[model samples]
Target: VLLLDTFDFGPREDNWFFYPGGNIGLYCPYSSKGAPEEDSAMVFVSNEVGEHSITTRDLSVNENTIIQFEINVGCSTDSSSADPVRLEFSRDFGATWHLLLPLCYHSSSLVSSLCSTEHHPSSTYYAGTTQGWRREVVHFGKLHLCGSVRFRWYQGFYPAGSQPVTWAIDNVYIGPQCEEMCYGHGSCINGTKCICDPGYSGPTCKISTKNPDFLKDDFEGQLESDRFLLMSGGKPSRKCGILSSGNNLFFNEDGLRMLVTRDLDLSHARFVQFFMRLGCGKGVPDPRSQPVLLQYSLNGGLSWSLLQEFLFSNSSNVGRYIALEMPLKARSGSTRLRWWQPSENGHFYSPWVIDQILIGGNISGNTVLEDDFSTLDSRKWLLHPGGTKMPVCGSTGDALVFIEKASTRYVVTTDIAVNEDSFLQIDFAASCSVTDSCYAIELEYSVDLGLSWHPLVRDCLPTNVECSLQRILVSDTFNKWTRITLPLPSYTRSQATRFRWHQPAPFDKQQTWAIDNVYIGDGCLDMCSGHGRCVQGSCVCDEQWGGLYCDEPETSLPTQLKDNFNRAPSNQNWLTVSGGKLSTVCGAVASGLALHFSGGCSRLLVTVDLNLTNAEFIQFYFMYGCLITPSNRNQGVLLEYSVNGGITWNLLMEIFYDQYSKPGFVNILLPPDAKEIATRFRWWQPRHDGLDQNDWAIDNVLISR
Candidate 1:
């Protein structure tokens, strides 16, 4: 805190903050820290004139102590309007500054001259409201320590006000300044200890050149397909990915691989980042097992570099796709890199599933710039809103259509689970005419498999886009690069299990909405702990945490992803579905199409609470649009059970909502046999056409036996 009693400005009210000196408002000569070059000075020169103080914090000073300054004066007339200004500081109630240096003045060293030197007002910084606050550090070569501190700035001229001139000070500093102690590597604590982020296991970020395969239970959710596993769950995982045709397909290998684009430079970055999670079970792999190697490639395939070398070993973890980042430095001056998993040895087990493999360096600029959920071939994000309106691709592309008569949907979920609130910025464009009206776009979530759904933000809130003063969807047909921030409510309950963006009921697009860049973030502005401060939308714990989240130990990218105290699902068992197929893709029920459950589902417990993921409902229906008679063979059934087994039982839940029925839902539920083992339950379903040969497509056959 530098105190300024108050000084006069020539031809104006000159005022500015100064660091190094010169012959102007404020200037300091260069001192030799080894004074090879000159001292770097700064002066807060402004066009306006007023009384201001030089705050140490505003000086951009981090962890340093001590300071110094040179003073001078100058004048200007026309364009540049350079002139002298006043400077101030507060330490003692901000009442006054005790000047100590050059009590007298000389001639040629004129007060307003350019070459005029000899410092002014040098002393102690003790002026205001600091009774409770202590005078931590005073920086101003022996001068401030002896008595007062200095302040200077160039004021603007021409309006009877002081003509501003740039003020410069030198060798100025305050208590302690931050350093690159992490050395661009590990997490730094105080001025010494360095904690490393995940993937990086070193004392200081400086020695990072290796990454290890973390176990599944270690972090939460979606494990990158190419995750470097130290222990394989059982057999080899599949390298299933988007095939050349855009549809999802398994690589038929124990591992997966990704090739980098030719435009990126490999010589600089030597790291790789990824995400991973359990296949399907709500918990970790059963029976325990070995780990898969999450490795990388540079020369196409010939060679590979293993990321981490550790195996995840937690039995109580529920399935959740987690996000992870890794760094792979070149051991022998190599870049040209890409990565994948080596499930090759796991061929004896099963195919590996891999997705979202981002390869880059520590310097985060523009990486993976595009995430357009287009290509149906190797497509990762699925859009399910009951239906999609495919445009009438003028004889070239296939037209997108919207499903009518209900039972239609656009399922959109990133293999990655978003546990935090993120910015949902997608490029959407309206491709309809001005006369066309806007259709409602809904954002829905399901925490319970798919029993029930919860709505966070509806496109046509209060009503349609016309209802609110703030229109949600723009009038444009194809909105591109449009940033729409949707705040996920305080789920208070369990974290959402699934999320989908779509056009709910009476599905129709005023035109068409093309979306890309559906990002989830806790921050509204740029990424990174955000504004060089808050971490993950929270405060940056001082002297404690660091990284995008103060939660990241003073370490590497961080390998911690578990709420260790939490256990897996209680009184529950998992059932894997064998062969499955989509008998009918997402289309309207127009032609009287019924959902064929014959395949994906055999005997499963259909429960309420789809959005909650907690299956415990008394009723559920699945009728296309017409009422199926009790004798109808295609009748769908819902299975509900009690601990009594088969001895005694009632209707578990069932229904069928044919289009001809009410404008709402109608389905079926099968009753559980009281005597059948008593401890288990399930339901069986066939094609939507039931006994008919109607399209019966099914996927995932999970039964609660």
Candidate 2:
């Protein structure tokens, strides 16, 4: 198998010669109707045509040789027999020629039938417009032709005083054809191998690339109910039981309504996530006992294992949306998931709605390398002499800093292996003494072991002064810190990939930049620490696992636990999960320390390793010093509890305050599930005002059995 010659008519190569040359030459198409394949092709424009022809150079051939090319014809008027394009071959050097017929002709059935006969050579000529480009294949062995040959596309004797007609030929190949032509998904190379397209690979390009997700259904427009095998009372609807405002799958009727998904490939799947809401259309005898069970089947629905249970109590749980994620422990090619409600004696009118289901591999936390710059280890980084480690410009810790200098300075990372899914993350800040300076710190990466570099973030000068002035004021006014996560290019995922942050321009006094928290990895945040899976930028912990990284064990509660806030919170088991601080000004007692929360947004205060297994009640003193107007009445603090570490929380109470609000003692009874070992409590303020507006504090916290 071999490829002797090919003519694509690109800029640098053209092996065809024009005889009686008038309007026959290589043309780069400017419009869609010109070229048959790539940018350039051999074209013949008939004006006063009388025997104009384009002939290829001599090409070596064997008994198994084949020729392939694309051709397109366009005519202003109906084509006649005299001006048809004829295919011919010559064994000698253009001395004698013989007509050659295509292996397969594409056109009207009349033309196809006429061309397939053992008739005169004129019967096989292309006489009219082809309407579009079509491929033609010629086999020398089948036609009883061999040896070196020169091919010619010849047209003769065109009628005058008519609009010009044109014909094009492109992508000519003289070689042995590949098996099955690479299934039309790849290019045949040397007739022995296939260069498959992206997203396809195989010996013959017959297999599709692997995807992360096997199934994803949003149920937005028309519902695809056929994808599911429904039983009992499962139905798809756009009515009352939806999670938001779109369509959803709902189980409405009685005796065991079940919805089962079709078999899906779960060989690489990590978890499944969906939004669900349960509601009652009418009164029920025991709604709490009627739970919706989610199950998975690895043997094509023959046997099932319970994945999770959804239980609702009374009307309080109704109409509240719950986002749930279940990890897949079994890996199989054929897996099915189903949600079913068991049959019960009592009449239960509660219908469960489910929407936005996704089953896919874990999306985040695939960290390969991370550096917070706490200490500049030389093994991990190549530090420039001009760049020093310092705590400056409000960075979290020690950061790589570049001061005023005349030459370019850079901090480069050591070579690390990366893949197509890898990303670069950094926290950095830059400033200048000259307010209107258009200087910037650039980030670049190299895949060729520092031989060459490509820009990731370069030359960020603004287009206008107004926009640049605003940016300078915001960043320089406060020396703000910025974090960016950039997806690396596919070509940059080599074995010795390197990244560097450099000040490419010279700087004067007071022009400075700092960078910290350099991370290079598979776009995940901490990789869930083996206790949870990252999905869409958040962690979904496994059963008995919790916390942001899924590393915290389930804490057990003692007989009693109390925190008076008279001492430091670390000694009393309090942890600030989000945004809050300890302050004495807003304490419950005058000039005494307490947990203070004041911000324009949300904040959370959590307890570390202090579960409620033996707790019966929780008591605390609450006070607010700011006024709550009617417009902001809905914004307040909430007490919540989580039974699986801190992965999920359930609201226990919402506390609102007014102008006359004073320090008051409050007590709340613990729920039955909260008495479990993993349960933890938190004070969460979902909304608030600035420091002068919605100030609040909590003190004298106590939990007892």
Candidate 3:
């Protein structure tokens, strides 16, 4: 009937509404042995009877009202009536109370109207052969109806010297009948609304019907939508069709009408959504007349009801599809759905098209195009051998091949519709022809078949045409298979859009490339976390967020542990120096100073606390002297991390001195468990047995998120 108490904050909170002077208190599950739902809650543990009660601020009572809560009594040595824990109710504040349920020791008849569970405590926390702590729910009914109600709980101490009977209480709910009573499926809103069982709806949710689906269409085919009829007076050019050249529906010279074939159930008539656009030189809807209107019908279209009046555009102009969604109201079970619009005064319409019509919650975000080539559909793709070479290499059945030529044959896809976030991904094998110095590949898109194409660039350089990152350029003839993900945006999205992969002109006869597993989809990892800008497919982190995904805080300074190696001889952040020396072998950016080792082995120890703002990596630049001595390949920098302030350490990575040695960078990902507040890192130049210590230099050490 009334919520007397729900001790969530802690047991100390019970002191506010519950009477004190009892052994009942809050215990944190993390620190205490027993679980208390989440975080902390009330626990009864004492050598004597412990009582806890909460008097309602003020309330009422109904016939179905009841008291419910979760309780766990570990290792009890008592019976239901004489159980260590018991529940009682009071209609006169806390003046007097009557037993409604015994939390423990129930023997069927005594708790016929109550619900409870028996548990036995774990032997680890209890040594006796008593019942251990098992989670259970308890509910008390038949409360005395009154204006004021309070509830109390009392626990009897465990048998002398035995593990004290411990009890935990959480998730207390005592109130009048929940709204909707969950229709036998779930509880109502405070206990919360019934998410309702599948295929059902109503006040208490007693209604049931077919789980209708939302309608979505791109006009590539007839129609995938709720069946509706046409009802209009004008000879409106009507039929489900696409544009003469593109794949989107074209509704030209219209008057239009769509009416549901049958009465729309509650779920089917919730919301209607669609995308529409007016092409260039299109008619302007008269402000005084109805241009587009949404209407519903009752009695199965015998009569109509106007839901909304709208206009696609008043000006004759071309534009991308603009989406619209309208919410619907419950009217009659004999009702239908409809949408209609009258053409502007003469035949002024210029072929307007609408697509992606949805009527309910089910919407799609699937890839617009996906092809693995396993079932190569010839109708959807075309290949043209170009130049004077055969770039189509023999395939191994599992892949499609394109190789060895200046301008390879064109591999093009049929017209596809893509959005700004769409991306074309493909796995391929590429290499410079054995005798060639380099290899290159280009990706282009067409808006009007293959008549014209524009190369996709990583960035706009020279304002427009002089883009440098226009092709996939590799400088070595070394061959390997790799994957490339190209993001498509802006002008790249269109109804007649097509994509092609080709090599540049002026035959190079020795460039090798292979293509396979291609797909176009709208799967983006994070929209820059809404804090950064998305360039192509990757996020360019904003001012206050910096991480590969821009997921960490942009607190660059407070957390960065740095060393310029200019402080090298002194090692500003180092805890110790072992055979260390400073020298700028390839020179430095700022100090012209760097940590160099000309000796056999060396290590610079730094005792650090990794706040680092959860930064993902550690980075630094290094260079090696041109002259390589015996065993120099083994001379490398071993970066290690320690959790106990250097008592021991684990290798993070080894940066080889002989690997691409003209001054390169290393970005080491910091391990998760290595993020303790007392973690430490050290860089050591591993010993090169017997060989002269070739020059190895390091500079600008920093930690970044």
Candidate 4:
């Protein structure tokens, strides 16, 4: 508190009382002038020239202080205009001063620039029309309170007939100010701590960084349960829970209720992160077996976005902390988050813990591939004869098909460089008129240029039935579309991989088969199975295998006699087929070395003679699409071994490939007893009455010890 004086000077004598000043006046309320009392000393000898005062008496306050004072601005009924007073402060004696406050008697046009301030007067009060003294108390908040500061009062003169502008001030008081006047926008309290506004921040509420709103409760401060609601059993706890972190929350069964925090302008947020530890059952709440989930809410507490659910277990407890992150999209200014697990009530469970939760991330970027197939890219695909462009699933694109009542050649694709983690994505729909063996769709790919192809899709068709009536046919005709997302094996991720869609001609009326939205993208889980670098989240597997994770071993074996069907059929006993014929129609060989079985119940034969019978294995590849009635035998291909010429035969294997199966390689080891003489091996298809035989092919036959 600062006090300059009380102003109790009884009489007005020697008008220049304080020191050197302007229009020195002394009034007993009666005297009018003196020696030109009107000019120097008299009963209020005030002029319109403006009264000024410069005191040698230095009185003031410091950086944080308030200024208080009382004043009486009186006037007579005969006064023409009311008077206004503006007080000021100066660093130098009286050279310059800053306007502090202006006390005006009348608030009308009569008031000039001298009447108000830009920051508004802390006290707008005044003494109304009166004849005697009217008192008014005013405060200047602390704008005028500073170290070694000197204050002055200047009463602006009223007009001509303004009977004596009696404006006198007394009871001046100045006290320590609030640290920062509360930053003017907020408050500086309890010594110098700042409480900021929603838009302003920092020590003095002088800076704002856009997202100035933040809620940081490591449960370090007070419960702040109002902000980070740690609701357990309808009541908040002193602490949330504790684990390895020294000072943290403590959670348990009796009331381990919930944990969630307030909002922020996640308006443009992109990611979130947090760390957790869990314990199940009771006691320490072992996190060894239980998993917890972290979710977000954008609508206050209504709807929630499931971030993720993961385990907090590190059985051995190495880095037992489970730190997780999630990407976000457009959110509101009040987004919320929660970390919790199942309750210990109905379920047999334990306690869980959470710590250092943070939310935010950069939102705009990606590396995924998508194709609606709105436009066909000739460079990446081929529109084979049996394939056409059509719409399925409201999306129009290419579909592998055959004309009505017809059987067309197979459809293949141009080479496509599949990513190591690639998967074939497509939607298909088929309608066939035939009730039995109608049509079928098969997916095959070639990894070795155009040499050998592998099946990724094959149907299991029975003899006596057409694929159209079987699994391959879509009964709903124009509506039922089948969607398939098949992950390609590592061996199929080649620069020259060609994915072919083969749907044999529908044996029915109108075969409307189509495929749409042909797309491929990385589908493998762990990049390269920890064996290589991840190129766009895909494992470009290391050397051993070219499979998605470099997991498939290289194919190579010592073979004494091998037939890849790369050779033309010469009148050789090894390349003869009893009920089938070799086709080179597309002249290029459909199955690389395809053997077509159009004849009923026939045998595709191969004879290999060995001296010491050092060979130990026989391998072959075959593909089939057939149908047979229940009364008829299961139309299957039997692998037969005969030691004597046209004598007794030994059945090695009998398989009836179905619509859902594919063409693949198979090998069998030779028995010790059979390693002694000339051996003949043949794949025989049972005699198909007539309608039971469709088409079948095989390639790549080899014998190796």
TM-score of each: 0.23, 0.34, 0.28, 0.21
lDDT of each: 0.31, 0.57, 0.48, 0.46
Where does candidate 4 have its weakest 10-residue lDDT segment? 117-126
Residue lDDT tens for model 4, 410-494: 4445455666556665556655333322245566787543345567644333333334211222333222464544556676765
Q: What's model 2's overall lDDT?
A: 0.57
lDDT tens readout by residue for model 1, 1-705: 222111222211123333222222332332222233333333334343453234332232222323323332221111111232333443443345332222111235436332123321213221110111111122233333323333323232333354344343333323221144334233233334544434444565444444321111112233223332211122123332221112221223221122222212344332333334323334444433334344444422223455543233453122223233334354222223332222212222222333333343222221111233334311233333333434332211322233333333354543223344433333344333432443435556665433355665532211121221122443332323233434344551233244555554444434344444344444433332211232234333324335443333343221111111123212222121212222333232222232333332132332111111222222222323222322333334434343321211244433321222322232322233332222233343322343232222222222222
Residue-by-residue lDDT tens digits, candidate 3, 36-107? 555344665544433433333434556666554545544332212123454655676667765553222123
Candidates, ranked, TM-score: 2, 3, 1, 4
Candidate 3 vs 4: which has more lDDT: 3
Candidate no. 1 TM-score = 0.23
Number of the predicted model whose lDDT against the real structure is largest: 2
Can you tell me which runs of candidate 4 are displaced by over 4 Å? 1-370, 392-410, 418-420, 432-437, 458-479, 505-509, 523-705
CA lDDT for candidate 4: 0.46
Question: What does the lDDT come to for candidate 1?
Answer: 0.31
Cα error, residue 253 of model 4, in Å, equals 94
Worst 10 residues of 1 by lDDT: 126-135
Question: Model 4: what TM-score?
Answer: 0.21
